Amino acid sequence: VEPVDPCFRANCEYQCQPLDQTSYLCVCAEGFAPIPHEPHRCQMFCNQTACPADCDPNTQASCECPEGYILDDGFICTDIDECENGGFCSGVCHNLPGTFECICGPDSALAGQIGTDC
Amino acid sequence: TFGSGEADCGLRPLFEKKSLEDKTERELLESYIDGR
Amino acid sequence: IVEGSDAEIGMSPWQVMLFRKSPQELLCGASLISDRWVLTAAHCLLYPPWDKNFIENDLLVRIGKHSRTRYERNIEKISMLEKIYIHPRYNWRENLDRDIALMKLKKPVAFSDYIHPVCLPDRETAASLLQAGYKGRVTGWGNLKETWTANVGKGQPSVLQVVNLPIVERPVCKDSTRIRITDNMFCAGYKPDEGKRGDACEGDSGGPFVMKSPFNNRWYQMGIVSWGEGCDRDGKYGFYTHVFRLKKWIQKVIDQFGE
Ligand SMILES: *[C@H]1O[C@H](CO)[C@@H](O)[C@H](O)[C@H]1NC(C)=O
Ligand SMILES: [Ca+2]
Ligand code: NA
């Protein structure tokens, strides 16, 4: 019958963007990305010091923050500085927005691990 | 071991350690005085 | 905390905040009893009737906090939970008897002006301090009023709350409720004729009921905010988990599962 919009039969939480006449992709609003294990669903992300929390307006003050972030004043998700905090990395630690890099050795080259300790 | 009674616990850096008393600390101390 | 006041910076360095990751919210209070052990109430973590069952990865342990909402960077410290130990004989079926749980932290917390463990009472401390009329202290970030209906108040505090409450004689605690009271619990709070008031409330559970020793000037955790009926009602008293009575179990899991 050419051509079919694949999104007509899609069940995305937020939006749907067509790829082919047969395939599509469920996408999210800016600041959100599909959940890896739930591709039709969305979850907030942040790559800075802070980003507004994902709060549900159907229930007062129920907010979500991505991993590595913690709710702060003004319902904002702020980055947890695992290096300054301590206890997350015993080797050399570099803080990241959302996680941290832990360098472990004491051998040559040294392994750069993301989000895990030595 | 734990619970031996030798550990350094119960002393606040900003209070007992500096010989400073908090606002209502006296109230608890005054409750110990029993009426004969 | 109902009828309390703003805690001073460093007033309760042992006060711990159990924080739920999803959604991001206060779960309950707790206490630091060593550099790797945290004490709280069992009902905060497990209550089958409501299908409540929080595991190590569902929470964050926040030590050294003052403000309820602010992320106190470089002041507060976040500790990861290695293992939660709920008392095997915790009676969620009826009384909430033995409402107690231990949490071993993955790494030892760094002591500071805002972080420092409270002492646990020994036999003598418990006998000398745990007497009717003697005042203890309760702290927490819980509700400022019984809420959950109509009520004029700020709801949740902006800063850690503190209240001084006197221990009540056992028979008066017994006659105030129809719920069976065990020796693993004690009640505290003012009587109607005293005028002064105050009480723990929702969200305060797990927080410590401490007493300062007139002998050695150290603070001891005599109780854990466990339960009550409403909050700050006349003729009602907050019920606390008797720490000394369960000290044998505390010492058992800490010795077996290491310090
Ligand atoms: C729930 O599961 C956890 C393990 O994920 C276990 O520790 C706990 O005892 C269980 N409790 C109930 C009531 O299912
Ligand atoms: Ca980080
Ligand atoms: Na979205």
Ligand code: NA
């Ligand atoms: Na009252």
